[PDB]
Design an enzyme around this catalytic site. Structure first.
Site, PDB file in Angstrom:
ATOM      1  N   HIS B  41      38.645 -17.113 -18.317  1.00  0.00           N
ATOM      2  CA  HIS B  41      39.130 -17.740 -17.100  1.00  0.00           C
ATOM      3  C   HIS B  41      38.078 -18.142 -16.265  1.00  0.00           C
ATOM      4  O   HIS B  41      38.333 -18.973 -15.040  1.00  0.00           O
ATOM      5  CB  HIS B  41      40.109 -16.901 -16.304  1.00  0.00           C
ATOM      6  CG  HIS B  41      39.571 -15.457 -15.576  1.00  0.00           C
ATOM      7  ND1 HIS B  41      38.901 -15.509 -14.607  1.00  0.00           N
ATOM      8  CD2 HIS B  41      39.707 -14.315 -16.012  1.00  0.00           C
ATOM      9  CE1 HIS B  41      38.325 -14.474 -14.491  1.00  0.00           C
ATOM     10  NE2 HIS B  41      39.175 -13.422 -15.216  1.00  0.00           N
ATOM     11  N   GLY B 143      34.305 -10.123  -7.656  1.00  0.00           N
ATOM     12  CA  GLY B 143      33.835 -10.615  -8.743  1.00  0.00           C
ATOM     13  C   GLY B 143      32.864  -9.903  -9.836  1.00  0.00           C
ATOM     14  O   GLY B 143      31.747 -10.085 -10.266  1.00  0.00           O
ATOM     15  N   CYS B 145      34.766  -9.488 -12.968  1.00  0.00           N
ATOM     16  CA  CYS B 145      35.254  -9.719 -14.025  1.00  0.00           C
ATOM     17  C   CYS B 145      34.162  -9.946 -15.038  1.00  0.00           C
ATOM     18  O   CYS B 145      32.920 -10.470 -14.669  1.00  0.00           O
ATOM     19  CB  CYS B 145      35.982 -11.339 -13.818  1.00  0.00           C
ATOM     20  SG  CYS B 145      37.459 -11.157 -12.498  1.00  0.00           S
TER      21      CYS B 145
END
Ligand SMILES: CN(C)c1ccnc(N)c1
Lengths: 299, 301
Positions: B41, B143, B145
């Protein structure tokens, strides 16, 4: 999402070495051309009890110390004692030496410990220095010499070195200048930690974290005085709060709009009446190993 | 004694963390040999996050659209492919700090460490378990991820998890390093909710056995139970049902303490009924469920 975290341990892993004196093996910290470890490595079965370290160290030659960094052996070329830490000068500067400083922390302040066995890093955990100057650590034997540290903007602040396990499943140690935290001695003698208390300023920080994370059910309309709060807190084995502690919480008060003595009235009510089956940040128990600084960084 | 939960030393993983940027989106990547792995993503725009067609989006991208940074050094992307939900970026430089490693898929109840990172920079490390509902109760770091979960065995790093998203319940969801999600989640910002979480009963029992080995025995009782009777009671407390595999796994702890597994189950049943009564077990005021039998047995001979 509020989980306790230790600092990444890589910079410290690059410093751990194995130190052996006779039959005793423990961990050392290799910084520049010096290896630091607990002075009791020099102790023997006879020595154990009432040792005179200094008499024993100057009568020890450099070749008595075996230092191993992985499979490469460091040759000790000098040795000196500073309080309870032994400093072994070695023939090689550690190329993995990070930017670092030696600092002394206060009870209630947090740091990470890299638990080691035979100079090999085993695990890392986050903890606070208890008000009784002990650390609730692990019981990994052969960990004496494992160190505690914080990382600030690429710089490792070493604040603790493990020396001994107390009978109650808690650890005691020194700073990197060999000064003990707490009223302990490095000798095999009957020693016990005093009764421990909860770090009130950290509990308040954690309540501030809960509010920032939208867990606000415990906020009440009351305020209390610092004296009334302290009388109640000490009856529950909570540390007394100082004006310094109130000041440290100032920024969280400005961020949340909850005055310190307002949050104190919330904590006071929580002590006397409990949580009544409710949770805060998903925990049924109040966390005291998060400092106000830890909360501002994470939140 | 006091069993403190520990994470594995994170150094071997810190040497693999890089920053991956796509347009305005920056997140973490894992650099192993000449490949950077990150959540696919990273390639979505704000308009696509409800229903991104990753194959459509990936074909439109070129090597030069990806900015991969290891510290202050820019790595050159020379290839890209998608494997389930993980993006694989081939780079022109093999990571010299690549440790020995494996990709493994874990099961609920198993534990691992997470190196929480921001902008490719490692921020903190924590120990956790994969919950029975296939989520992780991770930190709220922005953030994060692309942060990974791992175990370390004899200097071999086994990567088992990569963080993909935060669910409305504050919990986190991700995939293994082959890009397969844990649980029934998708890399889409659509309405997704974690099912009710349960306690990892086998881990609690292992922890109670650890307490017995350390002389904490206040909670023991003289009762035993059947496995079926235990499961009927446990589920009433949102505890996972115990299977015969779990009984076998606890075998060595039972043998070391001399307490049959079903005997310990009866004690757990009593703890659920009574509560801790303000007492502690191994220094903790709560029943711990993020210590596996594997970890207990190794640490207690
Ligand atoms: C107090 N002791 C033993 C000190 C103080 C300062 N420096 C060194 N090296 C030792």
């Amino acid at each position: 999402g509020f989980r306790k975290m230790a600092f990444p341990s890589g910079k410290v892993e690059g410093c751990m070495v194995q130190v052996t004196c006779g039959t005793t093996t423990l961990n050392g910290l290799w910084l520049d051309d010096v290896v630091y470890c607990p002075r009791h490595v020099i102790c023997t079965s006879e020595d154990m009890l009432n040792p005179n370290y200094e008499d024993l160290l100057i009568r020890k030659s450099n070749h008595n110390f075996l230092v191993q960094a992985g499979n490469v052996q460091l040759r000790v070329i000098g040795h000196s004692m500073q309080n309870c830490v032994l400093k072994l000068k070695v023939d090689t500067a550690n190329p993995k030496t990070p930017k670092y400083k030696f600092v002394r922390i206060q009870p209630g302040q947090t740091f990470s410990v890299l638990a080691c066995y035979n100079g090999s890093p085993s695990g890392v955990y986050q903890c606070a220095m208890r008000p009784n100057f002990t650390i609730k650590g692990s019981f990994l034997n052969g960990s004496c010499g494992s160190v505690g540290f914080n990382i600030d903007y690429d710089c490792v602040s070493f604040c603790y070195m493990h020396h001994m396990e107390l009978p109650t499943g808690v650890h005691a140690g020194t700073d990197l200048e060999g000064n003990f935290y707490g009223p302990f001695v490095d000798r095999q003698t009957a020693q016990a930690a005093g009764t421990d208390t909860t770090i009130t300023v950290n509990v308040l920080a954690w309540l501030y974290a809960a509010v920032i994370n939208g867990d606000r059910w415990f906020l009440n309309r009351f305020t209390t005085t610092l004296n009334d709060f302290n009388l109640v807190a000490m009856k529950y084995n909570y540390e007394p709060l100082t004006q310094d502690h109130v000041d440290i919480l100032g920024p969280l008060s400005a961020q949340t709009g909850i005055a310190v003595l307002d949050m104190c009235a919330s904590l006071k009510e929580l002590l006397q009446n409990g949580m009544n089956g409710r949770t805060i940040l998903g925990s049924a128990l109040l966390e005291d190993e998060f400092t106000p600084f830890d909360v501002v960084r994470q939140c």
